[PDB]
Amino acid sequence: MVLLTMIARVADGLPLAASMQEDDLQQYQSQAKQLFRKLNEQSPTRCTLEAGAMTFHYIIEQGVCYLVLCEAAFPKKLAFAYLEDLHSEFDEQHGKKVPTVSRPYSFIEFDTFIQKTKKLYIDSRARIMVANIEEVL
Amino acid sequence: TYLEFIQQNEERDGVRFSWNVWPSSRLEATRMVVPVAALFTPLKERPDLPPIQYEPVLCSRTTCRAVLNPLCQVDYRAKLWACNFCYQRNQFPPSYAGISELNQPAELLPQFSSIEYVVLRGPQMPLIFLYVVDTCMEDEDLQALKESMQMSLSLLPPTALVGLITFGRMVQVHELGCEGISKSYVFRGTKDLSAKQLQEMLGPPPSNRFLQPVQKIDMNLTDLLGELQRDPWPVPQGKRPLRSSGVALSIAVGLLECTFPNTGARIMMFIGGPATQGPGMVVGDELKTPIRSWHDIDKDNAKYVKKGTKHFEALANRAATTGHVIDIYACALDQTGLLEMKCCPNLTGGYMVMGDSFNTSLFKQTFQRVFTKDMHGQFKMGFGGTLEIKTSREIKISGAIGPCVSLNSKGPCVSENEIGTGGTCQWKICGLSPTTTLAIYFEVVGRGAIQFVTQYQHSSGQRRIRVTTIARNWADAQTQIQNIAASFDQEAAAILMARLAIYRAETEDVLRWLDRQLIRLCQKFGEYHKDDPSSFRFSETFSLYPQFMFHLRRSSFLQVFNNSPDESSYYRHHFMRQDLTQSLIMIQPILYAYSFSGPPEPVLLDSSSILADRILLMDTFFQILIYHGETIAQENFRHLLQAPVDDAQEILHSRFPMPRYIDTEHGGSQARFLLSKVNVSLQVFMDHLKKLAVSSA
Amino acid sequence: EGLRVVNLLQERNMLPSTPLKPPVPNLHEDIQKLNCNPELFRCTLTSIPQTQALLNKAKLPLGLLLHPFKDLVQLPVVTSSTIVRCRSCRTYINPFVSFLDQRRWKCNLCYRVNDVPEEFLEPHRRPEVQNATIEFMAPSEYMLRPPQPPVYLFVFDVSHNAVETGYLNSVCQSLLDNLDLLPGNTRTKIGFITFDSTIHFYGLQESLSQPQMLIVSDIEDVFIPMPENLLVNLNESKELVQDLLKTLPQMFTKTLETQSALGPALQAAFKLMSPTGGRMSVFQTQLPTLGVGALKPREEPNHRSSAKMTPSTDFYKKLALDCSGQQVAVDLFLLSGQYSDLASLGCISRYSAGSVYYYPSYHHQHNPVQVQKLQKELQRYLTRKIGFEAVMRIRCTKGLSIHTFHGNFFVRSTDLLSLPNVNPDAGYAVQMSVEESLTDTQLVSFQSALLYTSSKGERRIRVHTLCLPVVSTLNDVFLGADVQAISGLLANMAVDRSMTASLSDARDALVNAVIDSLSAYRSSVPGLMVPFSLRLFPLFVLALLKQKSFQTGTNARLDERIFAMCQVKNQPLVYLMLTTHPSLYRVDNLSDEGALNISDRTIPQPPILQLSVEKLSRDGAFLMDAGSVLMLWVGKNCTQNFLSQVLGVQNYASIPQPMTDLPELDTPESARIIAFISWLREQRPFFPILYVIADESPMKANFLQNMIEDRTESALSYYEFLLHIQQQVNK
Ligand SMILES: [Zn+2]
Ligand SMILES: [Zn+2]
């Protein structure tokens, strides 16, 4: 029921936008970058990974991956709707510049929309595949 | 007429005894079935008694020190009077020098037996209102709560002091009117704080930074209350909000304790849900686990009850010792935790309101009845009451039951057998109204005298002393039980016995004790041949007592199951405070019938009163229900459909806790309330009672 | 030039009239032209000794002084998809590598040959090999987390003493004027905390009428009161933070809070910045007395106490190390009128790559000098560029080993400086030794690399590479000595010697450095014979001994000495030399021998005078460039032309007692002196205030405290110093 969001280009795994708040982050950020390296043009477009007490959720659109991490108790129904809101906004604002950039995190300023959308889902008073992540890694 | 005697004594002195003729011997005092008990209302309203603005004129004896009353023997020639309690002869004060037979003081006329004095010596202290606001609730519930508090702010006196404490996960003590910044002191709702600690962490009429006069702060408070938003902390999925009710109350008590002790103050706490964190916790933050029920507390499946109850019990004694009132206004769909917090309004004179949502006419109207004024625009509430009871040397006080705290005062009027909050001649009542009714239980160890002296702080700030002196005839030795049987108040004794049963159920079988005394009362004052149940009759003085006992043992006051623990605490709360007439309505709800064949008429609480072509209006004190038969469940048909509605509106105002209204008919789901209060059955209950009254004693 | 030997007892006028220039290493022409700029990177010995035994013979310190983040006029930014680095020691491809196979380059630090990848293509003409200073775009693996946003947290002391100083008014005015000039893009976050006996947070929401002052009174158990609107987005909430900056100086005018809880306040500020990190600005005005981190009062010394420094507690050191681990840097602004134990307070900035700022006896009315100084130093502090969550590694060729670091940072792994922030005004020093004899090579190199997240959210690497030759002769080591760099490295070593031992040992080791080196030079050749490169060595060391850092018989106070040592450990070499040995000019007779090339301006070039009262004159006026200030001294018998045409006064008596600057009059004498002053402050980004207050009787003649060549009642003159050295050289 917490936060970890990353947006990366599927081809080379190039990060595009992310957002993290702690007050660990070092292990699940590696596994996130492991997955971005493994994803290709044959990977499932929508999937959910189990990592014990944590659970990854991602979608893939226009060669761009939208990954989110949360505790396994977080509703998988809400996790995909959160990635859909990010995709439609990111594709509408930067969907045509993605295959041209080469810097890591060329869209850091997407940090703003990620966090204002993030709070609309981590609050109950505001209202596909499954595989163990250790297999894909 | 004994009925005229009972009616007039309640209207004049605000008291109703179980017996108006007391046992003159030790042999009959011990064998009394229903104890000599009084249903005393210290602030009962009446046809505009003249307020006495001079000193009370007390007896010149250290131990006695009674108040001059009509039972005192006077001597207008020698300017002397004899105290009726200790036989001490006193001299009149110089202000009584021009005393005469054709112009005597008020306190000596039997009309002025109950009377109120005014003590103007010290500068009057202002009233203090502390708002303790929960912020873990829905927007529509929090907005309505905000509007209700802003309206109550507009009714307060200009001299009164006000403070604001909002809480959720944290506790905010707001420093009012601090320019353009609006600051507040944030505290963790995880650990408890003493008053001393709070004092070191925080710092002409008096006022603090946290408690300021209304006339100088009302504009900033009404803007603050208008901008109060919900608790900013997110509530994750499947979780309850972190609500620190136990610490917020302990900071409100701790705040007033180190600022204005021993003075009228009202801590009005508004709750939208149970305490999920800190001392005073009621349930965990996991929605998977429900709030405890009676079935959970009997099978030992409620790990927060005893630890949470003890926390609020210490807060209750802290505020009651200091002399402050604690109000609790709870509104939520789930339970709130009234079972754990009940001692705060019960020990003090605090109100207890329970609804489903602050955004209803039920709460909004009830909340503004709190601030109802009288013929002078002054609140119908007193503060810091001190009840002292002077009895004849033959009378001793077992104890009191009701909203009061013992001052632990010792004297020859204290009885060994203590009952309720007993073992004292003095009681403190931090909050009293024109309704607050204590139950005083006496014990004998003509004319016997009892004097009630009540010192409280009026809403105007004046200090008032209400003296009530009653007298009841001693029994004639040649007609002991005969006169005692005629002076029996079956209504008052039923409630005074109900007071004892509920006090033992709330501080634990109780029904076994309630039956052994009903059977004992049948054998001593009934007419019957031995081993002949059909011969049992009862005088018109006792005939209604078995029926009042049938409904009492089946009511929700003693059958706690099929109700939530917060509902059982709410029902018992109001019953331990109300006067006689309202208490009878709680135990035996009144039922009126409406049909074409005659005007409205009261009918029995039996299943036979439920006809198809008749409209019923059951008046439980807590709920008003209009029932339509199967035939009527469809200008002459309008007069019938609105006759109970009109009669409902009238009584749906004067009652301070506005009862819930229910419009239902045959087959409707809400007809269950009528079917459970109605009707093993009384017929079987009476036959079993007669079989035990005519056989062994 | 000069291989000649100098007799310091006969010259007595060796100081040059033009500014000192750093030496040129004895390198080949094509190699030296590509060497690093000496302002960014320089060495105490431009000729590195071949062995440690040779270095010990010279009795001179070997070390590096670097200014890695200095503002540059031009910077090559390589955005290569691959960063060519040596496969062994990870040294960056630098201009001093050895290309052989044209597809294989020999690393100039570990001598391993590496394969030149295709992307590189004429491999040597690529910018990474044509620039000793270069900035790379770090790839994905060069960061532990997404680039952090710029987070600025300002923490203000609001006690009764702080309100009396009136500093809050001007600081809030600087933030309002520089709100749009703060480095960062739309991700910038800003927060505010005030404290006294309790910590005061400030929530900023657009749905509320006004900010909310959330006060946490639990001093022993601090927490964060609100999760969202404490560190707010500056771009969205600009209007909200502007009202608070206008409302803050008005809230505490009638305060009776006499104590200050700095310790717990910094813990509250740490918890608030822990998730993201950033720059934490602390403004303290008195001794911390309440709560954790409280400090006891000390009695200030006098001119009579002997040289009998270190912090009294380790709270502010432990807290700074926690700030470093969370990428939080703490800059301390001390505006104290009494002793505040800066020896302990300074640890919050030393071990967190921060920087302390000291304004003694600040007062909005009584001290206009400190007011304008704070205004200008805040104008620089708020508008200069900045890098976040930074690390720096200093490399050198095999055989040379760095063994001691100097500056504001945390040393994680020998050679791995953690920089929670990196600022362009910070200087660093390093001491090294020859662990393995350099018999193999004739060149040795040094490389510093600075990984940081810019204010625009881009992980960048700035790399500097230095190359020096190796010699094996005692004389060759002396011929390449940098007298300024040696003085700076000795000043850093002396500060550590003070904390480590005492002030006496620090002063003695400084004097022994001049004795041992010149005695070693004499034992390898009547008067005091020194080489040409060390003719100013006893001068700059005597000036070091009379600086407020190491002086003894002066009436200096504790916080002044600690702050002077904090400037030694953190200032670049130039400003350290300008502070120690200010440049003294005469300015009442400027003329046309200047730099009149600058289009329309002439800009006189008056000769630099030696720091002696003998060089002054009661008939003229003398300006002293002390680096951070410009003290203009006016003589009593000053000419009437300088009074009315430059100062705007008709006689010496009516020169205003506290003069904050010169007037810009319509006189050619004013145009000359304003041109010379403006040209001085254009050689630096830290705008120095200039006060003419130095009269012959203003009771503020600390202008004379910099005359380091004259004798005083408790220090030797420059000639007395040379006499003492000669007695020890040939003892
Ligand atoms: Zn008496
Ligand atoms: Zn290498």
Phi, psi of C482 (to 5 degrees): -100, 105
Q: Which fold has domain C582-710?
A: Severin (3.40.20)
With an 8 Å Cβ cutoff, is C206 touching chain B? no
Ligand 2 centroid–CA C90 distance in Å is 5
Tokens 């008694």, located at residue = B49
CB neighbourhood size of B516 (10 A):
12
Contact C278, C390 (CB under 8 A): no
Report the candidate in B392, B253, B243 with the shortest Cα–Cα distance to residue B323: B253
Tokens 């003894």, located at residue = C552
DSSP code, position C627: S
Phi, psi of C171 (to 5 degrees): -70, -45
> At how many degrees (to 10) do helices B490-505 and B580-587 cross?
70
Contacts for C174 with CB less than 8 Å, ≥ 6 apart: C375, C378, C379, C382
β-sheet bridge partners, residue C11: none
CA distance A121 to chain B (A): 9
CATH superfamily of B53-113: Zn-finger domain of Sec23/24 (2.30.30.380)
CA distance C213 to chain B (A): 4
Q: Which fold has domain A1-137?
A: Beta-Lactamase (3.30.450)
Instruction: Indicate yes or no: CB of A21 within 8 angstroms of CB of C145.
Output: no
Q: Which fold has domain B476-587+680-697?
A: Four Helix Bundle (Hemerythrin (Met), subunit A) (1.20.120)
Residue A33 with chain C: CB contacts under 8 Å: 140
With an 8 Å Cβ cutoff, is C145 touching chain A? yes
Contact A133, A28 (CB under 8 A): no
Which residue does chain C place closest to A119, by CA atoms? C228
Instruction: Indicate yes or no: CB of B188 within 8 angstroms of CB of C221.
Output: yes
Nearest by CB to A104, from C149, C456, C459: name it.
C459
Q: Say yes or no: domain C149-384 is CATH 3.40.50.410.
A: yes
Q: Which fold has domain B125-380?
A: Rossmann fold (3.40.50)
Question: A27, exposed or middle or buried, with CB in 10 Å at 0-12, 13-18, 19+?
Answer: exposed
Report the candidate in C403, C402, C359 with the shortest Cα–Cα distance to residue C378: C359
Which residue does chain A place closest to B136, by CA atoms? A125
Ligand 2 centroid–CA C279 distance in Å is 34
CA distance C214 to chain B (A): 5
With an 8 Å Cβ cutoff, is A77 touching chain B? no
CA gap B581, B516 in Å, rounded: 26
The DSSP secondary structure of C267-333, one letter per residue, reads HHHHHHHTTT-EEEEEEE-S---SSTT-----PPP-SS-------S-SHHHHHHHHHHHTTEEEEEE
- Chain A with chain C: Cβ pairs closer than 8 A: 52
Where do the H-state alpha helices sit in B269-376? 294-298, 305-322, 338-341, 343-347, 361-369
CA gap B617, B190 in Å, rounded: 49
With an 8 Å Cβ cutoff, is B230 touching chain A? yes
Phi, psi of C418 (to 5 degrees): -85, 125
Contact C670, C646 (CB under 8 A): yes
DSSP code, position C412: -
Q: Say yes or no: domain C29-35+75-131 is CATH 2.30.30.140.
A: no
Contact B694, B529 (CB under 8 A): yes
With an 8 Å Cβ cutoff, is B686 touching chain A? no
CA gap B671, B662 in Å, rounded: 9
Domain ranges of chain C: 1-21+471-581+711-731, 29-35+75-131, 36-74+132-139+385-470, 149-384, 582-710
**Cα-based distances in Å from C202 to A33, B287, C187, C216, C227:** 38, 33, 20, 11, 12
β-sheet bridge partners, residue C395: C447
Interface residues on B facing C, Cβ-Cβ cutoff 8 A: 170, 172, 178-188, 201-202, 223, 227, 229, 232-234
User: What CATH number belongs to B1-52+114-124+381-475?
Assistant: 2.60.40.1670
Where do the H-state alpha helices sit in B614-681? 636-654, 672-677
Instruction: Indicate yes or no: CB of C247 within 8 angstroms of CB of B180.
Output: yes
CA gap B664, C557 in Å, rounded: 89
Domain ranges of chain B: 1-52+114-124+381-475, 53-113, 125-380, 476-587+680-697, 588-679
Mutation target for A interface from B134, B135, B136, B237: give the one with most A CBs within 10 A: B237
CA torsion through residues C119, C122, C123, C125, sign: negative
Interface residues on A facing C, Cβ-Cβ cutoff 8 A: 13-15, 18-23, 25-26, 29, 33, 102-105, 108-109, 111-112
Instruction: Indicate yes or no: CB of C187 within 8 angstroms of CB of A108.
Output: yes
Point out the annotated binding site of C for Zn(2+): 86, 89, 107, 110
CA distance C200 to chain B (A): 9
Tokens 């991700």, located at residue = C187
DSSP code, position B74: E
Nearest by CB to B232, from C198, C210, C227: name it.
C227
DSSP code, position B404: -
Report the candidate in C169, C175, C209 with the shortest Cα–Cα distance to residue C192: C175
Q: Which fold has domain B588-679?
A: Severin (3.40.20)
Return the partners of chain A (3 or more C-beta pairs < 8 Å).
Answer: B, C
Contact C141, C90 (CB under 8 A): no
Contact C388, C452 (CB under 8 A): yes
CA torsion through residues B223, B225, B226, B227, sign: positive
With an 8 Å Cβ cutoff, is A76 touching chain B? no
CATH superfamily of C36-74+132-139+385-470: beta-sandwich domain of Sec23/24 (2.60.40.1670)
- Chain A with chain B: Cβ pairs closer than 8 A: 22
Nearest by CB to A15, from C140, C186, C275: name it.
C140
Contact C552, C502 (CB under 8 A): no
Residue C213 with chain B: CB contacts under 8 Å: 178, 181-184
Contacts for C12 with CB less than 8 Å, ≥ 6 apart: C719
DSSP code, position C646: I
Which ligand has the minimum distance to the alpha carbon of residue C113? 2
CA B285 to chain centre: 33
Contacts for C398 with CB less than 8 Å, ≥ 6 apart: C109, C110, C111, C436
Q: Which residue precedes each gap in chain C (C to N above 2.5 Å)?
A: 121, 308, 525
Reduced DSSP (H G I as helix, E B as strand, rest coil) percent helix, strand, coil of chain A, to 5: 35, 25, 35
CA torsion through residues B682, B686, B687, B692, sign: positive
Contact B349, B325 (CB under 8 A): yes
Structure tokens at C652: 């010496």
Residue B179 with chain C: CB contacts under 8 Å: 250-251
Do you know the residue count of chain A? 137
CA B596 to chain centre: 40
Nearest by CB to A21, from C79, C233, C275: name it.
C275
CA gap C635, C616 in Å, rounded: 9
Instruction: Indicate yes or no: CB of C217 within 8 angstroms of CB of B202.
Output: yes
Helix (H, G, I), strand (E, B), or coil: what is residue B250? helix
Instruction: Indicate yes or no: CB of B184 within 8 angstroms of CB of C226.
Output: no
Chain B (127-146) residues lying within 8 Å, Cβ to Cβ, of chain A? 138
Q: Which fold has domain C1-21+471-581+711-731?
A: Four Helix Bundle (Hemerythrin (Met), subunit A) (1.20.120)
Mutation target for B interface from A2, A3, A124: give the one with most B CBs within 10 A: A124
Residue A108 with chain C: CB contacts under 8 Å: 146-147, 149, 185, 187, 456-458
Mutation target for C interface from A20, A102, A105: give the one with most C CBs within 10 A: A105
CA gap C5, B384 in Å, rounded: 101
Do you know the residue count of chain B? 697
Contacts for B599 with CB less than 8 Å, ≥ 6 apart: none
